[PDB]
Amino acid sequence: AISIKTPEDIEKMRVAGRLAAEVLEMIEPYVKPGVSTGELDRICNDYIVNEQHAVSACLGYHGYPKSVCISINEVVCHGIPDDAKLLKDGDIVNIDVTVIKDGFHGDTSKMFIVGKPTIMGERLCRITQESLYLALRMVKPGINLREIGAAIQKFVEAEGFSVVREYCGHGIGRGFHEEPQVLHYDSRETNVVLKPGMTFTIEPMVNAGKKEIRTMKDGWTVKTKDRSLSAQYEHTIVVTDNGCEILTLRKDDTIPAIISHDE
Ligand SMILES: N=C1N=NC(N)=C1/N=N/c1ccc(F)cc1
Ligand SMILES: [Co+2]
Ligand SMILES: [Co+2]
Ligand code: NA
């Protein structure tokens, strides 16, 4: 039950994906020691609504109270922007943006290293991004999603890191989360052969320590059980006749938007 997007639908997803990437490009100069995550979220929401003329997909979703998710250090995902939570030197911070424009969603996230980097935070982020890139290079018609999950997990584990099991990438379109599930690890339950026109995300969450996670009493914030650092990067893509096209590419990405496997 995976929708195949029309050329028209794909163009709408290009528009929405560009907007989502542009929020991440816009916010970058504000991501500095001393800024609050609450302030970052307000800046993002104002940009999305007032400049992009779009809406945040997260706001109100299952009751989520903010417009973006901002996850620092051992927070794995779903970190809630807060006026009292200040960024500081050495922090690694995920900002995850999902916008709806003209009925279609764009979904992307990246890590920011705040101020003076720690070497371990830098390495975790780099390996996490590399694991996303490796997976993007695999996407083409006929490949199984299982092969991609397996490859992400092998790469990450060889570095002494772990992949979070509880969360996955997803189909995306008129809905935020559509079929298929995109596991970032090997499972016998995964059997999805890719076809041109499918649109989905890849979004591995990678912990420096052990894979186990925990939800806080606020009902939202997820942390590593061992309090190790965690990192995530996310792109939305469309499968093409010969590979894929990344819909949420930024200028700071170092992988081509259009990946072709033809001669
Ligand atoms: N699956 C996701 N990809 N990017 C995001 N921001 C995602 N999910 N966010 C949420 C997931 C569950 C929820 F209740 C509220 C938000
Ligand atoms: Co996202
Ligand atoms: Co997503
Ligand atoms: Na994190």
PDB file of N, CA and C and ligand atoms in Angstrom, residues 96-98 107-108 168-172 176-177 201-203 232 234-236, ligand 3:
ATOM      1  N   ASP A  96      14.920  18.885  13.866  1.00  0.00           N
ATOM      2  CA  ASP A  96      14.126  18.084  12.945  1.00  0.00           C
ATOM      3  C   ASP A  96      12.931  18.933  12.545  1.00  0.00           C
ATOM      4  N   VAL A  97      12.845  19.185  11.241  1.00  0.00           N
ATOM      5  CA  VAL A  97      11.850  20.053  10.635  1.00  0.00           C
ATOM      6  C   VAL A  97      10.943  19.252   9.707  1.00  0.00           C
ATOM      7  N   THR A  98       9.632  19.414   9.880  1.00  0.00           N
ATOM      8  CA  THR A  98       8.660  18.836   8.959  1.00  0.00           C
ATOM      9  C   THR A  98       7.633  19.891   8.626  1.00  0.00           C
ATOM     10  N   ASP A 107      10.509  16.596   5.137  1.00  0.00           N
ATOM     11  CA  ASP A 107      10.943  16.155   6.462  1.00  0.00           C
ATOM     12  C   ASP A 107      12.450  15.965   6.413  1.00  0.00           C
ATOM     13  N   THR A 108      13.146  16.674   7.294  1.00  0.00           N
ATOM     14  CA  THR A 108      14.584  16.608   7.305  1.00  0.00           C
ATOM     15  C   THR A 108      15.105  17.021   8.674  1.00  0.00           C
ATOM     16  N   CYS A 168      12.058   4.743  13.151  1.00  0.00           N
ATOM     17  CA  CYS A 168      12.428   4.390  11.784  1.00  0.00           C
ATOM     18  C   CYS A 168      12.070   5.502  10.805  1.00  0.00           C
ATOM     19  N   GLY A 169      12.613   5.397   9.599  1.00  0.00           N
ATOM     20  CA  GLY A 169      12.177   6.266   8.513  1.00  0.00           C
ATOM     21  C   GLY A 169      10.801   5.826   8.035  1.00  0.00           C
ATOM     22  N   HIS A 170      10.234   6.552   7.088  1.00  0.00           N
ATOM     23  CA  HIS A 170       8.836   6.330   6.766  1.00  0.00           C
ATOM     24  C   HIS A 170       8.524   6.859   5.388  1.00  0.00           C
ATOM     25  N   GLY A 171       7.573   6.211   4.739  1.00  0.00           N
ATOM     26  CA  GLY A 171       6.877   6.875   3.660  1.00  0.00           C
ATOM     27  C   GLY A 171       6.361   8.248   4.054  1.00  0.00           C
ATOM     28  N   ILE A 172       6.217   9.111   3.061  1.00  0.00           N
ATOM     29  CA  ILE A 172       5.799  10.482   3.273  1.00  0.00           C
ATOM     30  C   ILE A 172       5.135  11.035   2.019  1.00  0.00           C
ATOM     31  N   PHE A 176       2.149  12.521   6.877  1.00  0.00           N
ATOM     32  CA  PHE A 176       3.451  12.654   7.523  1.00  0.00           C
ATOM     33  C   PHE A 176       4.157  11.297   7.535  1.00  0.00           C
ATOM     34  N   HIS A 177       3.494  10.293   8.108  1.00  0.00           N
ATOM     35  CA  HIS A 177       3.991   8.933   8.125  1.00  0.00           C
ATOM     36  C   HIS A 177       3.112   8.031   7.281  1.00  0.00           C
ATOM     37  N   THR A 201      11.568   8.680   3.831  1.00  0.00           N
ATOM     38  CA  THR A 201      12.723   9.211   4.549  1.00  0.00           C
ATOM     39  C   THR A 201      13.678   8.096   5.008  1.00  0.00           C
ATOM     40  N   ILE A 202      14.922   8.509   5.222  1.00  0.00           N
ATOM     41  CA  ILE A 202      15.926   7.684   5.885  1.00  0.00           C
ATOM     42  C   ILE A 202      16.462   8.604   6.985  1.00  0.00           C
ATOM     43  N   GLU A 203      16.509   8.099   8.212  1.00  0.00           N
ATOM     44  CA  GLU A 203      16.719   8.916   9.378  1.00  0.00           C
ATOM     45  C   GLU A 203      17.309   8.167  10.569  1.00  0.00           C
ATOM     46  N   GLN A 232      21.393  12.044  14.876  1.00  0.00           N
ATOM     47  CA  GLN A 232      20.479  11.687  13.795  1.00  0.00           C
ATOM     48  C   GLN A 232      20.655  12.685  12.653  1.00  0.00           C
ATOM     49  N   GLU A 234      18.499  13.176   8.683  1.00  0.00           N
ATOM     50  CA  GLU A 234      17.321  12.748   7.939  1.00  0.00           C
ATOM     51  C   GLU A 234      17.219  13.458   6.613  1.00  0.00           C
ATOM     52  N   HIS A 235      16.905  12.693   5.572  1.00  0.00           N
ATOM     53  CA  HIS A 235      16.527  13.265   4.282  1.00  0.00           C
ATOM     54  C   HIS A 235      15.261  12.573   3.780  1.00  0.00           C
ATOM     55  N   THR A 236      14.502  13.337   2.999  1.00  0.00           N
ATOM     56  CA  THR A 236      13.382  12.815   2.210  1.00  0.00           C
ATOM     57  C   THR A 236      13.844  12.608   0.768  1.00  0.00           C
TER      58      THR A 236
HETATM   59 CO    CO B   3      10.895  11.556   9.431  1.00  0.00          CO
END
